[PDB]
Design a protein around this ligand. Structure first.
Ligand SMILES: Cc1ccccc1S(=O)(=O)Nc1cc(-c2ccc(C#N)cc2)sc1C(=O)O
Length: 558
């Protein structure tokens, strides 16, 4: 079973692609080493195809089936509802790819008769046909990174009408099933703070903690037909409407298991027999499968009290240590098991004895001190990619504003506060666009957010301490310092000066802007302000923010 079979037709761009960092009058204020930043384009799609194309083999033992049986028992307690066409339509991103059948995301959100009519015919076809492969478009993603250059990732997705149908049949399932089956181990239920909390408590629950992150190589490509049918067997355990069962069975046989791949020009590029990266079940399916294989592998390797944290293909394990030597051996067996399950490693896993040294979801726990001098744990990450992307967003408006999402998710960090907040608020002020709502993604779901609500959002998600953290760790400070030199970012003295200016301007604006100045930049003044809770905060309806993962799921919220 080859993950893909190719015809030779190229994966074509659907419009002009820029690979070099665009420079405008603001670029240099952020970073000077422009040649360090690049965007991937279809030009490197061939290289990716080569990496993701391989044969998969699977040897499934009793630990695998024992864990599966447990997962199904939990899945059987779940009751999921079939979404209505209109409900499904409302979950569609305003700029989601237009259908090939005469309508776009806008027509869908408006419940246009044409869109609704087509969606209804697609649904009917799903119920009547459970064998015909469904077409998919394959595109090379345009993503920004800082040099070592990686090839573009491949996104595979069905037509907009099919996507609306996926939500109707499975939105409720993928939104609720994961937490029930995996409990505390399901990562997408946590906000950054709760993640840290879970990690710290788990780490503290062991007598001699040891943990590791396990990077599966090209996870989507390792997912086999068996894996995808086992995922369906789990979904089918739920209490479901008869029409939902049929739709899920049909989507599994016709789309999830595999299908023909068409490029932007309409040519047949080949065939997929692995996970599609752009379907509704990509995150839920990967999480269930990663959790299933890892849980079984933990038993096979005889890991003592293995606790796991899984987010899609991202996996981190914290267990009871048995000595550095015994640990190396177990992890080696754990890896051998995952490999037999068709989840071979990219970077071999290594045991860690310092929670701060474990990277999962590209992040790690670190510690700082609040205004009281108390140690506080928070989530941070290497700022390289976030800064490379902010550089790009400094000269170009993009669909997803990573700078805003990073400020939200990494609000307590030294780098998000010193740089992203200062840099972008400065630009927003200058352009008088403080109150303009911008789109960003959180766990794959798209949200429309007004920058002026940041203080409230940050307090809600991270607590007041996010505005007073200081005395960061030596390791964290060193990483930030190294990153700034690499990219050529101005030093602290420059950002503090800019922040004071930005703050002063915001305070003068009054209202929310004043609050932004007050809380977001209190770190810049020598005589710190009081800083206390905020009224409007409780108004924000943050329900749904950290419930489930939807990467590639074409999901949008207010
Ligand atoms: C607390 C805070 C938050 C955001 C920006 C600046 C500050 S601060 O200057 O007050 N204090 C602090 C500034 C730090 C810093 C260290 C290295 C580099 C580089 N290259 C930039 C800034 S570390 C720190 C600390 O408190 O541990």
């Amino acid at each position: 079973s080859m993950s893909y079979t190719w015809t030779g037709a190229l994966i074509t761009p659907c419009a002009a692609e820029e690979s070099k960092l665009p420079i405008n009058a603001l670029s240099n204020s952020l970073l000077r080493h422009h040649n360090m930043v690049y965007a991937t384009t279809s030009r490197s799609a061939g290289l990716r195809q080569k990496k993701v194309t391989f044969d998969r083999l699977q040897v499934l033992d009793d630990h695998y089936r024992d864990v599966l049986k447990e997962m199904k028992a939990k899945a059987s307690t779940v009751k999921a509802k079939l979404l209505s066409v209109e409900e499904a339509c409302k979950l569609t991103p305003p700029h989601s790819a237009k259908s090939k059948f005469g309508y776009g995301a806008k027509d869908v959100r408006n419940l246009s008769s044409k869109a609704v009519n087509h969606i209804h015919s697609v649904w009917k076809d799903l119920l009547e046909d459970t064998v015909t492969p469904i077409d998919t478009t394959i595109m090379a993603k345009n993503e920004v990174f800082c040099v070592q250059r990686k090839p573009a990732r491949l996104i595979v997705f069905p037509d907009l009408g099919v996507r609306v149908c996926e939500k109707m049949a499975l939105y409720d399932v993928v939104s609720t099933l994961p937490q029930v089956v995996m409990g505390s181990s399901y990562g997408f239920q946590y906000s950054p703070g709760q993640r840290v909390e879970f990690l710290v408590n788990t780490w503290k629950s062991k007598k001699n903690p040891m943990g590791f992150s396990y990077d599966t190589r090209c996870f989507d490509s390792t997912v086999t037909e068996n894996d995808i049918r086992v995922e369906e067997s789990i979904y089918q355990c739920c209490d479901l409407a008869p029409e939902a069962r049929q739709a899920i069975k049909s989507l599994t046989e016709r789309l999830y298991i595999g299908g023909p791949l068409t490029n932007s020009k309409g040519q047949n590029c080949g065939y997929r027999r692995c996970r599609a990266s752009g379907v509704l079940t990509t995150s839920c399916g990967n999480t269930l499968t990663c959790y299933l294989k890892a849980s079984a592998a933990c038993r096979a390797a005889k890991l003592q009290d293995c606790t796991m944290l899984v987010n899609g293909d991202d996996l981190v394990v914290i267990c009871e240590s048995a000595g550095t030597q015994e640990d190396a051996a177990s992890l080696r067996v754990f890896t051998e098991a995952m490999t037999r399950y068709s989840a071979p490693p990219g970077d071999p896993p290594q045991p860690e004895y310092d929670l701060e040294l474990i990277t999962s979801c590209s992040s790690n726990v670190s510690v700082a001190h609040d205004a009281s001098g108390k140690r506080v744990y928070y989530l941070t990450r290497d700022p390289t990619t976030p800064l490379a992307r902010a550089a790009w967003e400094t000269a170009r408006h993009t669909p997803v504003n990573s700078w805003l999402g990073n400020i939200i998710m990494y609000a307590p960090t030294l780098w998000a506060r010193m740089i992203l907040m200062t840099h972008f608020f400065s630009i927003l002020l200058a352009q008088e666009q403080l109150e303009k709502a911008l789109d960003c993604q959180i766990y794959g779901a798209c949200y429309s957010i007004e920058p002026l609500d940041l203080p409230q959002i940050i307090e809600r998600l991270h607590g007041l301490s996010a505005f007073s953290l200081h005395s960061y760790s030596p390791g964290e400070i060193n990483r930030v310092a190294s990153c700034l030199r690499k990219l050529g970012v101005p030093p602290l003295r420059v950002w503090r000066h800019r922040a004071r200016s930005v703050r002063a301007r915001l305070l003068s604006q009054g209202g929310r802007a004043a609050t932004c100045g007050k809380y977001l930049f209190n770190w810049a003044v020598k005589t710190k302000l009081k800083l206390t809770p905020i009224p409007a905060a409780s108004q924000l309806d943050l329900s749904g923010w950290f419930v489930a993962g939807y990467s590639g799921g074409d999901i949008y919220h207010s």
